[PDB]
Design a protein around this ligand. Structure first.
Ligand code: HEM
Length: 180
């Protein structure tokens, strides 16, 4: 299901609060009703001199499988957003497949504070949208998102009741992979 185009970079968020530690997705919203599988995800985003690089993990809770990626792209000047190319790696961060240059994802930060964040991610494989997901993030696994981030969900036009909560899914994480 095609990504929403009504996402725009925000000015005025604090990037130091976003590019810090690791994030766990506590709640996710894929409006596509054709999907069945639910995921857990964690990632650790960094920024140096305008380049964003991040280590990413997905766990398919239905299939009990996982995959790992490293993304890299430029920090937008217009707001807290970046469009990254991604390679596939193993749990030891060895490269399994270099990036497919036709593929990218755009991550747009909607809110970020010391405990929590809200982001939107659209993954594109050339002219096909793999899909988009809104993710509520916290630094601690299974934590409660802040009031400020919960407000951002509403103010994005969304309802938190519609998100899937990951704390009940039986997630397996790889915390060594996302560690500092
Ligand atoms: C719980 C949250 C998330 C859900 C439900 C989700 C869902 C998915 C699904 C269904 C796929 C396709 C898997 C496959 O069939 O190969 C996927 C791939 C991908 N996701 Fe997510 N995702 C989540 C979080 C994230 C985050 C936080 C990022 C970026 C920081 C992200 C980036 C990507 C990328 C780049 C791919 C392509 C990977 C590859 O083909 O190697 N996703 N995700």
């Amino acid at each position: 299901m095609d990504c929403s185009t009504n996402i725009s970079p925000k000015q005025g968020l604090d990037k130091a609060k976003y590019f810090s530690g690791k994030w766990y997705v506590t709640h996710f919203l894929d409006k596509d009703p054709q999907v069945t599988d639910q995921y857990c995800s964690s990632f650790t985003p960094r920024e140096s001199d305008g380049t964003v690089k991040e280590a990413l993990y997905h766990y398919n809770a239905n299939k009990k499988t996982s995959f790992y990626n490293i993304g890299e792209g430029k920090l937008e000047s217009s707001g807290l957003q970046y469009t990254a190319k991604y390679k596939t790696v193993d749990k030891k961060k060895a490269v399994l497949k270099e990036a497919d240059e036709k593929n990218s994802y755009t991550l747009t930060v909607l809110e970020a504070d010391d405990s929590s964040a809200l982001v939107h991610i659209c993954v594109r494989e050339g002219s096909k949208d793999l899909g988009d997901v809104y993710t509520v993030l916290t630094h601690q696994k299974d934590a409660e998102p802040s009031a400020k981030v919960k407000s951002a969900v509403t103010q994005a036009g969304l309802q938190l009741s519609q998100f899937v909560g990951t704390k009940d899914l039986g997630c397996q994480y790889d915390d060594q992979f996302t560690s500092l």
